[PDB]
Amino acid sequence: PQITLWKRPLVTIKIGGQLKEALLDTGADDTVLEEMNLPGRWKPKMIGGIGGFIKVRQYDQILIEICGHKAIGTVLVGPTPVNIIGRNLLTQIGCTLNF
């Protein structure tokens, strides 16, 4: 679809078999989701945002469907203020900015 930006670009995602709402975030390199239970192995990692750095759990090669488009990539889980879909997955679904 074509998504205008007068409202937050929020979309439904499927991850670990569960539906969630997430923000399409072109300013995020990576995808960061709020605390949740995910199956598989993970590794401790750090990520920095506008306010500093936080600890996250890094899940690699995770299936995630974004607005009906399938992706398989890295998902970071930790105390992010909002579920954000970053460029690592936006590229997989063929997302571009246009003006």
Place this chain on the structure above:
Amino acid sequence: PQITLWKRPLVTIKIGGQLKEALLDTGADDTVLEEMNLPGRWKPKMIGGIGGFIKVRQYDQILIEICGHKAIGTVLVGPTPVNIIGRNLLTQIGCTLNF
């Protein structure tokens, strides 16, 4: 143009008579710019993201050119690590997400 998301969507902006590089950020409601000493009145604000909050100065009706597209709106100035063009200005330049 069409901007792919393999790398950060950085573009040149003009604000306060200065040229800067900034992110086209669909995940930001508002525009946040690196410390700069703009003239005029401002109001204090605190904005939160990954890592926590930073203190910024809110300037209203600021002229800003993004890739030759003119816009006018609110800009928040503070110790952000990167210049962020938010939806309040992205809509004014006709920017959309597409996939």
